[PDB]
Motif scaffolding. Structure first.
Motif, PDB file in Angstrom:
ATOM      1  N   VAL A 115      -6.648 -10.785  -0.467  1.00 23.43           N
ATOM      2  CA  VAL A 115      -6.261  -9.398  -0.693  1.00 23.43           C
ATOM      3  C   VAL A 115      -4.803  -9.322  -1.101  1.00 23.43           C
ATOM      4  CG1 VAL A 115      -7.985  -8.577   0.939  1.00 23.43           C
ATOM      5  CG2 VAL A 115      -5.645  -9.034   1.695  1.00 23.43           C
ATOM      6  N   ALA A 116      -4.100 -10.454  -1.073  1.00 21.94           N
ATOM      7  CA  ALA A 116      -2.708 -10.474  -1.497  1.00 21.94           C
ATOM      8  C   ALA A 116      -2.585  -9.964  -2.922  1.00 21.94           C
ATOM      9  CB  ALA A 116      -2.137 -11.887  -1.374  1.00 21.94           C
ATOM     10  N   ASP A 117      -3.483 -10.411  -3.801  1.00 16.05           N
ATOM     11  CA  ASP A 117      -3.460  -9.935  -5.177  1.00 16.05           C
ATOM     12  C   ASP A 117      -3.673  -8.431  -5.240  1.00 16.05           C
ATOM     13  OD1 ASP A 117      -3.480 -10.018  -8.021  1.00 16.05           O
ATOM     14  OD2 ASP A 117      -4.346 -12.034  -7.918  1.00 16.05           O
ATOM     15  N   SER A 118      -4.644  -7.920  -4.477  1.00 17.82           N
ATOM     16  CA  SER A 118      -4.958  -6.494  -4.510  1.00 17.82           C
ATOM     17  C   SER A 118      -3.780  -5.656  -4.046  1.00 17.82           C
ATOM     18  CB  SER A 118      -6.182  -6.209  -3.646  1.00 17.82           C
ATOM     19  OG  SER A 118      -7.364  -6.588  -4.312  1.00 17.82           O
ATOM     20  N   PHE A 119      -3.209  -5.991  -2.891  1.00 13.85           N
ATOM     21  CA  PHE A 119      -2.150  -5.147  -2.352  1.00 13.85           C
ATOM     22  C   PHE A 119      -0.850  -5.304  -3.132  1.00 13.85           C
ATOM     23  CE2 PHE A 119      -4.829  -5.675   1.549  1.00 13.85           C
ATOM     24  CZ  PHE A 119      -5.225  -4.366   1.647  1.00 13.85           C
ATOM     25  N   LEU A 120      -0.544  -6.508  -3.618  1.00 16.82           N
ATOM     26  CA  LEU A 120       0.683  -6.666  -4.383  1.00 16.82           C
ATOM     27  C   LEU A 120       0.575  -5.996  -5.746  1.00 16.82           C
ATOM     28  CD1 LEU A 120       1.600 -10.174  -3.107  1.00 16.82           C
ATOM     29  CD2 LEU A 120       2.770  -8.022  -2.717  1.00 16.82           C
ATOM     30  N   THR A 121      -0.607  -6.031  -6.368  1.00 16.81           N
ATOM     31  CA  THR A 121      -0.792  -5.260  -7.588  1.00 16.81           C
ATOM     32  C   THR A 121      -0.782  -3.766  -7.301  1.00 16.81           C
ATOM     33  OG1 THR A 121      -2.169  -7.095  -8.328  1.00 16.81           O
ATOM     34  CG2 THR A 121      -2.107  -5.133  -9.697  1.00 16.81           C
ATOM     35  N   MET A 122      -1.230  -3.355  -6.113  1.00 12.03           N
ATOM     36  CA  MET A 122      -1.081  -1.956  -5.725  1.00 12.03           C
ATOM     37  C   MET A 122       0.387  -1.563  -5.670  1.00 12.03           C
ATOM     38  SD  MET A 122      -3.529  -0.120  -5.780  1.00 12.03           S
ATOM     39  CE  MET A 122      -3.078   1.420  -4.991  1.00 12.03           C
ATOM     40  N   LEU A 123       1.224  -2.425  -5.091  1.00  9.04           N
ATOM     41  CA  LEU A 123       2.655  -2.142  -5.037  1.00  9.04           C
ATOM     42  C   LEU A 123       3.252  -2.071  -6.437  1.00  9.04           C
ATOM     43  CD1 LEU A 123       3.542  -4.566  -2.139  1.00  9.04           C
ATOM     44  CD2 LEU A 123       3.763  -2.115  -1.991  1.00  9.04           C
ATOM     45  N   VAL A 142       1.689  -1.301  -9.252  1.00  6.81           N
ATOM     46  CA  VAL A 142       1.214  -0.089  -9.914  1.00  6.81           C
ATOM     47  C   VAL A 142       1.938   1.134  -9.371  1.00  6.81           C
ATOM     48  CG1 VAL A 142      -0.780   1.389 -10.277  1.00  6.81           C
ATOM     49  CG2 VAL A 142      -1.005  -1.056 -10.543  1.00  6.81           C
ATOM     50  N   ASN A 143       2.188   1.171  -8.062  1.00  7.31           N
ATOM     51  CA  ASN A 143       2.963   2.268  -7.497  1.00  7.31           C
ATOM     52  C   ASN A 143       4.365   2.310  -8.084  1.00  7.31           C
ATOM     53  OD1 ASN A 143       3.906   4.356  -5.931  1.00  7.31           O
ATOM     54  ND2 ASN A 143       4.120   3.127  -4.070  1.00  7.31           N
ATOM     55  N   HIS A 144       4.997   1.150  -8.238  1.00  7.63           N
ATOM     56  CA  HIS A 144       6.357   1.126  -8.761  1.00  7.63           C
ATOM     57  C   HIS A 144       6.396   1.542 -10.227  1.00  7.63           C
ATOM     58  CE1 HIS A 144       9.954  -1.435 -10.271  1.00  7.63           C
ATOM     59  NE2 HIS A 144      10.343  -0.201 -10.015  1.00  7.63           N
ATOM     60  N   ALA A 145       5.535   0.953 -11.054  1.00  9.14           N
ATOM     61  CA  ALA A 145       5.652   1.150 -12.493  1.00  9.14           C
ATOM     62  C   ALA A 145       5.030   2.465 -12.944  1.00  9.14           C
ATOM     63  CB  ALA A 145       5.015  -0.021 -13.234  1.00  9.14           C
ATOM     64  N   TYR A 146       3.867   2.811 -12.396  1.00  4.15           N
ATOM     65  CA  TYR A 146       3.055   3.911 -12.896  1.00  4.15           C
ATOM     66  C   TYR A 146       2.896   5.036 -11.885  1.00  4.15           C
ATOM     67  CZ  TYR A 146       2.005   1.069 -16.906  1.00  4.15           C
ATOM     68  OH  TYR A 146       2.111   0.351 -18.067  1.00  4.15           O
ATOM     69  N   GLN A 147       3.698   5.034 -10.819  1.00  4.41           N
ATOM     70  CA  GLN A 147       3.740   6.090  -9.811  1.00  4.41           C
ATOM     71  C   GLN A 147       2.461   6.189  -8.990  1.00  4.41           C
ATOM     72  OE1 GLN A 147       4.982   9.444 -12.466  1.00  4.41           O
ATOM     73  NE2 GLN A 147       6.781   9.485 -11.125  1.00  4.41           N
ATOM     74  N   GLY A 148       1.491   5.321  -9.252  1.00  4.97           N
ATOM     75  CA  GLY A 148       0.303   5.272  -8.426  1.00  4.97           C
ATOM     76  C   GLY A 148      -0.985   5.562  -9.164  1.00  4.97           C
ATOM     77  N   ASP A 149      -0.964   5.461 -10.488  1.00  7.51           N
ATOM     78  CA  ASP A 149      -2.166   5.715 -11.269  1.00  7.51           C
ATOM     79  C   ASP A 149      -2.664   4.402 -11.856  1.00  7.51           C
ATOM     80  OD1 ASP A 149      -4.236   7.153 -12.355  1.00  7.51           O
ATOM     81  OD2 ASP A 149      -3.092   7.905 -14.065  1.00  7.51           O
ATOM     82  N   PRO A 150      -3.642   3.756 -11.220  1.00 12.38           N
ATOM     83  CA  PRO A 150      -4.079   2.436 -11.694  1.00 12.38           C
ATOM     84  C   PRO A 150      -4.733   2.451 -13.061  1.00 12.38           C
ATOM     85  CG  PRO A 150      -5.420   3.195  -9.857  1.00 12.38           C
ATOM     86  CD  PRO A 150      -4.264   4.119  -9.938  1.00 12.38           C
ATOM     87  N   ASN A 151      -5.256   3.588 -13.522  1.00 11.47           N
ATOM     88  CA  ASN A 151      -5.871   3.629 -14.846  1.00 11.47           C
ATOM     89  C   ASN A 151      -4.839   3.363 -15.933  1.00 11.47           C
ATOM     90  OD1 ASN A 151      -7.166   5.432 -12.801  1.00 11.47           O
ATOM     91  ND2 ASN A 151      -8.798   5.461 -14.336  1.00 11.47           N
ATOM     92  N   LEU A 152      -3.648   3.944 -15.776  1.00 10.58           N
ATOM     93  CA  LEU A 152      -2.554   3.665 -16.695  1.00 10.58           C
ATOM     94  C   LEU A 152      -2.219   2.180 -16.702  1.00 10.58           C
ATOM     95  CD1 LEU A 152      -0.299   6.726 -15.912  1.00 10.58           C
ATOM     96  CD2 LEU A 152      -2.198   6.518 -17.498  1.00 10.58           C
ATOM     97  N   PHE A 153      -2.300   1.535 -15.538  1.00 11.39           N
ATOM     98  CA  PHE A 153      -2.072   0.097 -15.465  1.00 11.39           C
ATOM     99  C   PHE A 153      -3.160  -0.676 -16.201  1.00 11.39           C
ATOM    100  CE2 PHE A 153      -2.692  -3.961 -13.235  1.00 11.39           C
ATOM    101  CZ  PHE A 153      -1.497  -4.550 -13.564  1.00 11.39           C
TER     102      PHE A 153
END
Lengths: 387, 387, 387, 48
Positions: D1-9, D11-22
RNA sequence: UUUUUU
RNA sequence: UUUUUU
RNA sequence: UUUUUU
């Protein structure tokens, strides 16, 4: 079309679902009997099932001098029948008392003893036409309520006194007598319809009472139907080519409001030449035209209308139309400003003429602000009176 | 088509499967007898098999002044027969007591002794039309339940008092008297149908009682059929060209829900001009229109409808439609926001006009949030009253 | 075609293979006799060969007020004859006891002594219509079994009490009285058919009892025929162009199941407008529609149906349909997921609208998981009650 | 889950929390084609 | 034998 | 069973 | 329920 299921039972065809028969009396002393009727009205005694008879007697005395057969051949009686309302001629030989007219039967003995209790005075000066005009005074603002009706009545009495037209007895000016007259008009349909018919359909020949009745009928037009007026004059704009919908009325809900409102207006226009008095006369499809079936459209239309006339700022609404009303009011104020200064150039005018017209439009706008604010203050005073 | 097997026995043809005969009495003292009937209603005594007779007597007194033959020639009696409901004229010579009307037979001796136990008072003022209007007050929110009906009745009594239309006895305002009237209306079909018929089909001539009855009939439209309203106004969208299905209604199950719902609506529209009152009158195909035959469609349609009107947020549902309802509500809120700001550009407007309209749309949206939240709070108070 | 040999004796033509004659009595005290019948039902005494007579007496009293000749001219009697069921009018002069109706003969002396043993009470309030509505309450879930029927009956009694429609005696709410009523309905065909006929074919005019009967008939549709519903709604998919078979129904055995099922459905649709109530009424080709003639098709269809509605997860099956049922359930869940996200793109939608709809579809899916799991837990509780 | 949560972080940093934009971002475009993909899964309520 | 919800 | 506002 | 000015 399954969407027809929503409109089932709204615009139904004309059928007669009732049978009413008002006795009309061919007598000798029609004026004397009508004076007795006016006196029993003044006494405050309620008329049970005979209100229609005696008030139609007064109307026949006023219009036809006391010959009910002419009334039975009149177009008012032609209209009333076909809605289930008929009249009987019954010749009365001698009428010493008003109780001679009312016949023996159940629940008429109750009224007869009370009417024999009252002691009349002979040769009353008040004619039936005077009572009919006074009653007609109540027709504007009758659907609004009792106090507003009484206020309008006092105002209109003042107006008609300063024209010199009429002179109502000072005992009619009392609050209580207006209370009894308001109740009598509110409950009774045939009196209101007869007043409406004689006001509308009399092309000439008006005496003082007919002039008063016609004026109050003209003032009663679309009383209780401000939604119709506002929508049809502002929201459903009328162009040379076609019908534009207002910019403020593009919402998906407001479109459905407009279609339903149209259907209600086909319902209303079926009462040809009587649609303006639908809420007064409680016609068929008047409950289909209400504030509450059309919340968005009602509030938006009244707000748009308020942006044009300074007097419509005095119209009250429920708790839930107020904010949308003033939101639409400010939106339409800004839109009217923009349209104002936008089509001056579209007309061929000099710099001088356009300059003068801009000064005029600004001056008009400030006058409108003065007037709308004053009406708002007067309305605030009215609510403070309510408090 | 083997899928026709699913629709067998739903939209059946018209056949008469019953034989009911209500005795109607041609009497002299129709008003006196009707007052006796109103008094036995007030006494709380239940009417066994004579409820139809006496309530139709009251309706005939109100509509036709007391001539049952005119009623037998009326279109209401024309409609009722052909559904198995007939009327007999029986002339009564002398009626000193209400028990004279009811005939000798099995189980009528039980009622006759109780009615002779009651001691009436002569010359009651309450007319049959007053009782009919009071009974009509119950028709909106009658299928909802007893308390909601009583609450609506009290509200509408207040409304009709402030118009000045009517004055019900203070003993009718009691909770218990409304209990007995609610029971009487709920069990009896012919009273409800007659009220519906006179409210719907009376084009003009309304007195106070007819005005009240017509208003309550207009308010009773599609009572108990909110699913029909929501689906047909939102889910089955009506365009200029054809009929679009809502974006939220594309699921494979919801498509079957839509086809079954359509079939039920062909069943409903067979009751022409009476479909709006199907659940009130318990018509044929009203059980085919229910929440539970159409769970997904019901919840989705009510959620989509709630996104438009702030008042539909007060509608309650079962435990199992709630979550899908608010899911659809938020989906439609976001979709309406997107459609809102998407078609401003499609209209030819300046930067100024579009700017003003965006301000107006935002203001309208916040007003809607205010109103929906307030309705939700009021509903929470209602459930707390239930707790 | 030698494969016709398999279908020999299934869809046979209509012939009358019986002769039944139910005596119907033209009496004076029809209500009194019907009350006696209701009381002997309440006593628990079984009716030998007279159950048809007395229950048809109750039905004639309810529908036709007590005139059996009108019933003999009714379409229900028209349908029953031609299936070998006839009625005799026998005028009874004086009926002091219920035993007067039953005639002298073999095995009627056995019943007559027991009925003379019972001591009745005069003037019972319970009408025949009340008993008919209570009996109709049992029709949904009657083929399921005794306890499920009783549970549904208690639930529906609660429902009808909170509408205010009816008030059954508290002695009818007892478990034992429902035991006797369930037995009486289960054995007797003419009572069930008459209830079905009056529920189905009454287009208007419902009193409380007729409303209850019609509601329970509408709820009884396709009771005991869930296989028909599941197959025809899911496995035999209905398209605009033609009929597609489900992806899960391609197996060589399931194809034969489908052809045999179709043949059985031509057998069922011969009972036009009565096919929904075939298992209730034990019609001709209902044994051709069973779980066990169609094991693969039954399990697959119920599994596919369970994947759509959360309530079908409560349906129980034998030991041998369970695993194939949930295998089909998971297959159809995954297929519906894929179809779900596959046809969003086929519709013209923005990124925004599709995004919102994907959120909505996910939310709907989790709501469905909540509901299906809850129904599974409730079913587990039900089996634990069985244990 | 390291990949999932770190990519969540991320996406939050770059795209404010919208994973579709990512998922439409060039980083996700590069990662796929090397065998690395992302799923959007909407979560309704996250208390923990 | 039927098994759900209505 | 129906659940709002009118 | 209607709410203005006429």
């Amino acid at each position: 079309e399954l969407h027809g299921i929503l409109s089932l039972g709204l615009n139904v065809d004309h059928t007669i679902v009732r049978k009413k028969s008002i006795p009309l009396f061919e007598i000798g002393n029609s004026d004397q009997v009508c004076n007795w009727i006016i006196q029993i009205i003044e006494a405050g005694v309620d008329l049970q099932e005979v209100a229609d008879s005696f008030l139609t007697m007064l109307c026949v005395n006023h219009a036809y001098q006391g010959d009910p057969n002419l009334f039975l051949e009149s177009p008012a009686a032609h209209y009333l029948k076909g809605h289930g309302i008929h009249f009987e001629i019954q010749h009365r030989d001698n009428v010493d008392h008003i109780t001679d007219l009312l016949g023996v039967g159940s629940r008429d003995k109750s009224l007869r003893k009370t009417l024999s209790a009252l002691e009349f005075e002979p040769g009353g000066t008040t004619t039936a036409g005077m009572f009919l005009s006074f009653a007609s005074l109540f027709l504007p603002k009758l659907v609004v309520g009792e106090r507003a009706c009484l206020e309008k009545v006092q105002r209109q009495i003042q107006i008609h006194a300063e024209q010199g037209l009429i002179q109502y007895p000072t005992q009619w000016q009392s609050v209580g007598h207006m209370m009894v007259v308001f109740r009598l008009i509110r409950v009774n349909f045939v009196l209101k319809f007869l007043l409406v018919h004689q006001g509308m359909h009399m092309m000439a020949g008006h005496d003082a009472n007919d002039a008063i009745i016609a004026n109050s009928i003209s003032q009663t037009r679309f009383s209780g139907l401000l939604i119709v007026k506002t929508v049809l004059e502002h929201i459903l704009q009328k162009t040379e080519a076609g019908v534009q919908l207002h910019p403020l009325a593009r919402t998906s809900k407001v479109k459905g409001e407009l279609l339903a409102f149209k259907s209600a207006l086909e319902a209303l226009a079926s009462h040809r030449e009587y649609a303006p008095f639908a809420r007064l006369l409680n016609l068929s499809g008047v409950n289909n035209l209400e504030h509450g079936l059309y919340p968005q459209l009602s509030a938006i239309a009244l707000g748009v209308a308020t942006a044009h006339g300074s007097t419509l700022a005095g119209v009250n609404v429920s708790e839930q139309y107020q904010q949308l009303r003033e939101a639409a009011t400010e939106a339409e104020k800004q839109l009217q400003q923009h349209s104002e200064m936008r089509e001056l150039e579209t007309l061929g005018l000099d710099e001088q003429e356009r300059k003068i017209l801009a000064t005029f439009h600004s001056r008009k706008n400030e006058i409108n602000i003065q007037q709308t604010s004053s009406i708002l203050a007067i309305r605030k005073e009215r609510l403070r009176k309510l408090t």
